Amino acid sequence: KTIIINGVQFNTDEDTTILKFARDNNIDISALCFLNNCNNDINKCEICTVEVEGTGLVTACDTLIEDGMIINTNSDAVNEKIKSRISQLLDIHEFKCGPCNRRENCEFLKLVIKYKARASKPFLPKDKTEYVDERSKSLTVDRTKCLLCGRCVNACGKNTETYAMKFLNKNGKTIIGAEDEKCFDDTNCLLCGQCIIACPVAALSEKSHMDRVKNALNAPEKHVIVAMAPSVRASIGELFNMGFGVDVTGKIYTALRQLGFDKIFDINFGADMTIMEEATELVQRIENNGPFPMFTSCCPSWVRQAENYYPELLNNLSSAKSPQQIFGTASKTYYPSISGLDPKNVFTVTVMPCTSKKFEADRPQMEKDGLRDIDAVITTRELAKMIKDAKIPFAKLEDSEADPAMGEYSGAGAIFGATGGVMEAALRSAKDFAENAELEDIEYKQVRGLNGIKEAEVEINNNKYNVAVINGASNLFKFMKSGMINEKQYHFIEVMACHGGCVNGGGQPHVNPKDLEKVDIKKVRASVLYNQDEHLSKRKSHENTALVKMYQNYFGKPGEGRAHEILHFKYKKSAWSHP
Numbered sequence: 336k337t338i339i340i341n342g343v344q345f346n347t348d349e350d351t352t353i354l355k356f357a358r359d360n361n362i363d364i365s366a367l368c369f370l371n372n373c374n375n376d377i378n379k380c381e382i383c384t385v386e387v388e389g390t391g392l393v394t395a396c397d398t399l400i401e402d403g404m405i406i407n408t409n410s411d412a413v414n415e416k417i418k419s420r421i422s423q424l425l426d427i428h429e430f431k432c433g434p435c436n437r438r439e440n441c442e443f444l445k446l447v448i449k450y451k452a453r454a455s456k457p458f459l460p461k462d463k464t465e466y467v468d469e470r471s472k473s474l475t476v477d478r479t480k481c482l483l484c485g486r487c488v489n490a491c492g493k494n495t496e497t498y499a500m501k502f503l504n505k506n507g508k509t510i511i512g513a514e515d516e517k518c519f520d521d522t523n524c525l526l527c528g529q530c531i532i533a534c535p536v537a538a539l540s541e542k543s544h545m546d547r548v549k550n551a552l553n554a555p556e557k558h559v560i561v562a563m564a565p566s567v568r569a570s571i572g573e574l575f576n577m578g579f580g581v582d583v584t585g586k587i588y589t590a591l592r593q594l595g596f597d598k599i600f601d602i603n604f605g606a607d608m609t610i611m612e613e614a615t616e617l618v619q620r621i622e623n624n625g626p627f628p629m630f631t632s633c634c635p636s637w638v639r640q641a642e643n644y645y646p647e648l649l650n651n652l653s654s655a656k657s658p659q660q661i662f663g664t665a666s667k668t669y670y671p672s673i674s675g676l677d678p679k680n681v682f683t684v685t686v687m688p689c690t691s692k693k694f695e696a697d698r699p700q701m702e703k704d705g706l707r708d709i710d711a712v713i714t715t716r717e718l719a720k721m722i723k724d725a726k727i728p729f730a731k732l733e734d735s736e737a738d739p740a741m742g743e744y745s746g747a748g749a750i751f752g753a754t755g756g757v758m759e760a761a762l763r764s765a766k767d768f769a770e771n772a773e774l775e776d777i778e779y780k781q782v783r784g785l786n787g788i789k790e791a792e793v794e795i796n797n798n799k800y801n802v803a804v805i806n807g808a809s810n811l812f813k814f815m816k817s818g819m820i821n822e823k824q825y826h827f828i829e830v831m832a833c834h835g836g837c838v839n840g841g842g843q844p845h846v847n848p849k850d851l852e853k854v855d856i857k858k859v860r861a862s863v864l865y866n867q868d869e870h871l872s873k874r875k876s877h878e879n880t881a882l883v884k885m886y887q888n889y890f891g892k893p894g895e896g897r898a899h900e901i902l903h904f905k906y907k908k909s910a911w912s913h914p
């Protein structure tokens with residue numbers, strides 16, 4: 336094919352869109368509703384308008400190049416059309432960036448600036464409460480910001496195949512929302528937040544826990560523990576202009592101390608606890624020749640997916656609490672026992688790359704003797720805002736260490752945040768446990784990486800077992816619906832709702848679509864975690880020194896007795912009932 340773009344001739348056999356071809360050849364075309372190789376098929380945004388000679392104005396993002404095409408991306412007519420489209424979006428947009436939570440990295444603001452667009456009549460809503468939905472424990476909607484670009488609907492479809500985010504006709508006007516405009520929690524929604532990650536503006540956000548945290552910090556009698564997820568240390572630096580793939584663990588510890596938290600622990604300690612219990616459970620299932628398979632239970636969006644779509648699997652879920660909840664349970668029991676704190680005065684905060692962790696922490700039964708396992712969960716983004724609001728110079732902070740008693744972690748815990756990390760971590764301990772050995776070969780590269788469904792054969796005590804790693808909620812559906820679960824007997828299956836694992840969770844820093852094409856965000860964030868594992872002295876969860884002391888002095892033997900009494904949680908399908 337011979338293509339001419341802005342007077343430049345190209346000769347190509349590529350079969351692709353104008354947008355993709357132009358961008359591959361360093362020709363600027365704007366886009367808004369195009370993302371994840373999809374645009375908004377109904378009511379296209381047309382920000383990607385170009386002019387094709389003999390045809391007129393076309394959308395570059397969904398028009399294939401054809402031989403003989405003569406294209407102009409920057410004519411007066413093209414720019415007036417794009418400016419008009421942005422102007423019409425401003426007409427439905429509460430354009431007040433000052434207090435907006437996307438002020439620093441908004442895609443729409445960049446387009447408004449680029450085209451110098453202005454509303455025909457400013458959109459100034461008197462009563463915002465009609466536009467805002469904060470009922471969810473995890474998600475919130477601010478429709479005064481919504482561009483009806485469809486990126487959340489497309490992302491939910493692709494990431495989960497639930498189509499829990501939908502277009503709705505609300506009193507004659509188009510909105511996005513959950514089925515029948517219900518609270519997301521009351522629908523089949525997984526609360527994974529991939530819709531937030533896809534949103535170009537501040538229309539979708541996490542349910543704020545910021546006030547819970549500040550009120551607890553300011554309460555004289557509260558002793559506030561903070562502990563961050565594996566993924567936070569591989570990601571939060573993005574929001575401080577430090578680039579991608581930067582390990583900022585020590586700076587986080589320092590910032591949390593400067594924020595006034597009273598104890599600095601780490602959820603990777605809870606990850607090692609989860610492995611203690613789950614690898615022990617796997618060995619008991621092996622020794623009892625069932626029940627198989629056992630599924631991980633640490634991703635609360637996967638738990639919701641099982642509850643909503645596969646309730647017959649709930650009995651197969653590991654009973655070990657997630658790293659967050661298992662840490663939290665220990666923070667109200669073991670921690671007072673080594674500190675003198677009144678358990679009622681301990682307030683446990685986690686920092687997560689995840690929105691469904693808020694739903695998990697707020698599950699009614701996730702408590703004991705009136706004490707919540709976890710009192711507040713803030714996302715990576717929320718912690719970034721806290722640090723900036725306190726004027727803490729994050730990129731310049733010196734490194735500090737965590738408090739050790741619930742803060743040490745092994746390399747197995749460190750890799751939890753990548754798809755296959757829980758699998759690899761659990762196998763390192765289950766094989767030692769079952770063979771009564773301290774084995775040297777601990778790297779299970781077969782379960783790593785971005786393939787959507789991964790499987791491997793492992794040898795445990797001179798028998799062979801089959802494991803699988805499901806990498807993304809849509810791939811859970813593919814694995815089940817395609818019958819893949821029945822090609823062989825699976826014994827242990829890891830499921831994460833977010834493709835790439837928690838490093839790509841719904842509470843993570845937004846990345847604009849341009850950077851997403853230069854940077855493999857899922858692999859670059861996960862690289863921080865595998866690097867920590869490679870350089871840590873202890874690379875198995877049962878070699879964590881602070882954890883071994885806690886089990887010896889307080890919990891006893893994992894998987895039974897006291898440990899099973901309080902560190903476990905079982906989900907039950909609803910009993911049969913009609914209708």
Ligand code: 402
Nearest residue numbers: 564565566606658659689752837
């Ligand atoms: N609880 C828990 Fe996890 C741990 O450890 C996180 O904190 Fe994850 C991350 N990063 C998140 O969110 S949840 C799913 N298992 C893998 S990692």
Ligand code: SF4
Nearest residue numbers: 431432435441536537
């Ligand atoms: S969503 Fe973007 S354009 Fe709209 S108010 Fe917030 S920062 Fe400004």
Ligand code: SF4
Nearest residue numbers: 491524525527528530
């Ligand atoms: S939270 Fe996940 S499942 Fe729910 S609407 Fe958003 S993308 Fe879909």
Ligand code: SF4
Nearest residue numbers: 481482484485487534
């Ligand atoms: S919520 Fe965000 S992604 Fe969804 S349609 Fe509105 S602006 Fe687009």
Ligand code: SF4
Nearest residue numbers: 634636689833837840
């Ligand atoms: S994969 Fe991690 S970040 Fe994503 S929903 Fe599950 S627990 Fe949350």
Ligand code: FES
Nearest residue numbers: 368380381383396
């Ligand atoms: S970016 Fe092409 S129609 Fe929206």
Ligand SMILES: [Mg+2]
Nearest residue numbers: 373374376397
């Ligand atoms: Mg399309």
Ligand SMILES: [Mg+2]
Nearest residue numbers: 551552553554
């Ligand atoms: Mg305080």
